[PDB]
């Protein structure tokens, strides 16, 4: 049949239709091709198609041979063996000529036939199939998993014409396979109603078919084992298991620990650069974000300024990278990436140059994009002694900052640092188009608002803190504020406020 | 005539339970229920772990637990032979009885055990290796084809153990051929207590041990 689902296979409707259109169209057509090969990853049904094609055509029973079985120690027996194998159709061709049936030969694991002895055996088969006497009643189907280890000569035209392929099933194919292998369960009512096949099809990814069957078998096994007690002497529910109903829990368990996939996946870490969100502890944050939005719209709309850059400056422990990430996510450009020194530990200068070049090469392809670079001074490692740093990465940056992208494309660049004077000394402060400033907490009112937003000290403690602080100014970074709060939250309720004030005084300084 | 205490494995109490759950449940329930289920029995177990953990003990005890004929052990790479095309015959001679019986008694036959040992001495990556005359690739292909081929066999169980799984070839580790992949490992205080108790039982039973231990 041409249904492709009656015989117990799914996921390759188009390939089956191609097989029908290309291979056997001539035979069906009112009154040829003599080479077929199959190759695909392990799993997805190949032997099934072999057996089905064996019983499909109104042809004689196919012969099944092995891969490494055509051999023998005594020179002479292998040649006689192949001769015996191929002797079947000779008599039929002799006695019936053109008006003869079709012969199907199945070679299993043919990859072991091509590699001295292997040369002669491949030559014998090669001559027999495509030699002086052309037989139009012989068809050979071979299958492998590693086509790389096959000879080119075996694949020339006139010998192996049709070269199909198999592939990992899609969601529809997985649903078809699950239907096929749960048909019996549904027919005998042994499957519970709470199970939802759509959820399983959505959840499972790239199981290549065989793993789906394994998962179904594992779920059956666990549902079967729930109704058996073994220790002293094996015993089973007997009658009570006659109503054994599988549950969603079994398909859950069989998926999370066993029946794992044979392939991998990827991971993302974009959540690591914001851990406490953003709180409006003061006016300047809104100003910074509004300026970022203006820059984003400027890069989006302009036509004769394709490249735009900005610099974020602020004393240490002032959350510059957090604002950089937030402004990056606000724009919602198609392509966004963050180049940070955390990945590159122990690298030389050349590796850093290559990494930056790769990131920018990726960024150039898309239409419009934005890139952010954080902690420049650590990227081109800097030490006040000497000073000392790298002169290759610096030039790479100074060149990449004023290189226009391909025609009709847009790139935005943001940079964050905490040492502006040094950058102005190296002359890199000229490249950037404009700069923005990130301040520190200055007035006690902003501090009190910050504590109120954090919600860690109550009205009495807050009043005491206000009395002790309103007559003073402050200079503190938000990250350090969180650290100090955590440090002072470790004492008993009696010493918390006094400890916090003591720590603030100890770290208390002026700009 | 069996009892979990008779084998004498200490510190591996959940691994054996998992193996019994996932490999021998199908063969114990009434045939009619299984036939209604239409499931196929597993045909492979793989074990690995650092030296001196209990793998071979598990294999021996599993072989002794069941019924029918005793297993057929293959000590390391004792299959290789110098004559051309003679290793394949030695590989194919192992499955002769299984093939014959499955052909003769349909789906009401006994059980045959095959215990491969130091499996990584034969089954290396097909494309790997160098020009060693190519015998190893032909061995791997023959084993792969015979374990699960066009002709179907469903009354054999194969156990394999090793010390470095990553060198086995992928085409062998897929559901159907060798599914369960355990990992025997170092014990913990409870396992250490169980092992110490196991190995000192008879001394306690014959009054050969002092009261201060």
């Amino acid at each position: 049949d041409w249904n492709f689902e009656k015989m117990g296979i799914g996921g390759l409707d188009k390939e089956f239709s191609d097989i029908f259109r290309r291979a056997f169209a001539s035979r069906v057509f009112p009154p040829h091709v003599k080479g077929i090969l199959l190759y695909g990853p392990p799993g997805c049904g190949k032997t099934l198609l072999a057996r089905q094609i064996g019983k499909m055509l109104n042809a004689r029973e196919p012969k099944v041979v092995n891969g490494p079985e055509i051999l023998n120690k005594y020179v002479g027996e292998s040649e006689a063996n192949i001769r015996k194998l191929f002797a079947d159709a000779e008599e039929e061709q002799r006695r019936l000529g053109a008006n003869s049936g079709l012969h199907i030969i199945i070679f299993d694991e043919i990859d072991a036939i091509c590699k001295g002895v292997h040369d002669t055996v491949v030559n014998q088969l090669l001559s027999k199939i495509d030699g002086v006497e052309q037989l139009n009643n012989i068809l050979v189907i071979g299958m492998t998993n590693r086509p790389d280890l096959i000879d080119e000569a075996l694949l020339r035209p006139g010998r192996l014409e049709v070269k199909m392929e198999i592939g990992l099933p899609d969601e529809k194919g997985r649903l078809q396979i699950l239907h096929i292998h749960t048909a019996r369960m549904r027919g005998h009512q042994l499957l519970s109603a709470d199970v939802d096949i759509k959820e399983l099809a959505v959840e499972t990814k790239n199981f290549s078919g065989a793993e789906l069957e394994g998962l179904v078998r594992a779920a059956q096994s666990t549902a079967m084992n729930r109704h058996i007690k073994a220790s002293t002497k094996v015993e089973v529910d007997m009658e009570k298991a006659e109503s054994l109903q599988v549950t969603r829990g079994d398909f859950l368990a069989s998926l999370e620990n066993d029946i794992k996939p044979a392939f991998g996946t990827n991971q993302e870490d974009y959540a690591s650069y914001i851990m406490n969100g953003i709180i409006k502890w003061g006016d300047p944050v809104t100003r910074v974000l509004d300026d970022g939005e203006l820059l984003v719209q400027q890069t989006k709309n302009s036509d004769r300024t394709p490249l735009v850059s900005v610099l974020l400056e602020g004393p240490p422990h002032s959350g510059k990278t957090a604002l950089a990430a937030k402004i990056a996510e606000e724009s919602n450009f198609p392509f966004i990436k963050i180049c940070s020194p955390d990945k590159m530990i122990g690298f030389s200068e050349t590796a850093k140059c290559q990494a930056m070049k790769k990131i920018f090469d990726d960024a150039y392809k898309s239409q419009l994009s934005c890139v952010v670079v954080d902690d420049i001074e650590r990227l081109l490692d800097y030490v006040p002694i000497g000073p000392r740093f790298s002169n290759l990465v610096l030039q790479a940056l100074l060149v990449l900052l004023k290189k226009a992208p391909p025609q009709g494309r847009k790139l935005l660049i943001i940079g964050t640092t905490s040492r502006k004077d040094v950058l102005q000394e190296m002359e890199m402060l000229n490249a950037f188009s404009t700069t923005i400033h990130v301040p520190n907490i200055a007035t006690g009112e902003q501090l009190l608002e910050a504590l109120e937003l954090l919600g860690n000290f109550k009205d009495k403690e807050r009043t005491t803190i206000a009395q002790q602080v309103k007559g003073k100014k402050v200079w503190i970074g938000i990250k350090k504020l969180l650290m100090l709060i955590e440090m002072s939250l470790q004492m008993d309720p009696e010493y918390r406020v006094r400890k916090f004030l003591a720590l603030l005084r100890e770290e208390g300084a002026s700009p | 005539d069996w009892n979990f205490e008779k084998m004498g494995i200490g510190g591996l109490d959940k691994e054996f339970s998992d193996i019994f759950r996932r490999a021998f449940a199908s063969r114990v329930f009434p045939p009619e229920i299984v036939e209604q289920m239409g499931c196929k029995h597993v045909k492979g177990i793989l074990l690995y772990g650092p030296p001196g953990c209990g793998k071979t003990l598990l294999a021996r005890q599993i072989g002794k637990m069941l019924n029918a004929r005793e297993p057929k052990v293959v000590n390391g790479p004792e299959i290789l032979n110098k004559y051309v095309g003679e290793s394949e015959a030695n590989i194919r001679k192992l499955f002769a009885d299984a093939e014959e019986e499955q052909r003769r008694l349909g789906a009401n036959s006994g059980l045959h055990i095959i215990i491969f040992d130091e499996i990584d001495a034969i089954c290396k990556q097909r494309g790997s290796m160098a020009g060693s005359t190519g015998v190893h690739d032909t061995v791997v292909n023959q084993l792969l084809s015979k374990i699960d081929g066009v002709e179907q066999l469903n009354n054999i169980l194969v156990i394999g153990m090793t010390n470095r799984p990553d060198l086995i070839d992928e085409a062998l580790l897929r559901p159907g051929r060798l599914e369960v992949k355990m990992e025997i490992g170092l014990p913990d205080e409870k396992g250490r207590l169980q092992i110490l108790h196991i190995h000192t039982a008879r001394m306690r039973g014959h009054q050969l041990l002092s009261a201060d231990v």
């Binding site: 120690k73 005594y74 020179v75 | 110098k82 004559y83 051309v84 060693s132 005359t133 015998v135």
Partner: protein
């Protein structure tokens, strides 16, 4: 550059073809023919 140290080799023989029994068979057959001719 890196010069390969050299190489080492492994061997795998094959069955021999003595084909010497047929000579004895042929000699015996010729003797058969001689005796058969004499008997007539």
């Amino acid at each position: 550059m890196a010069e390969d140290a050299d190489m080492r080799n492994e061997l795998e023989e094959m069955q021999r073809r003595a084909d010497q029994l047929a000579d004895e068979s042929l000699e015996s057959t010729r003797r058969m023919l001689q005796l058969v001719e004499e008997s007539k």
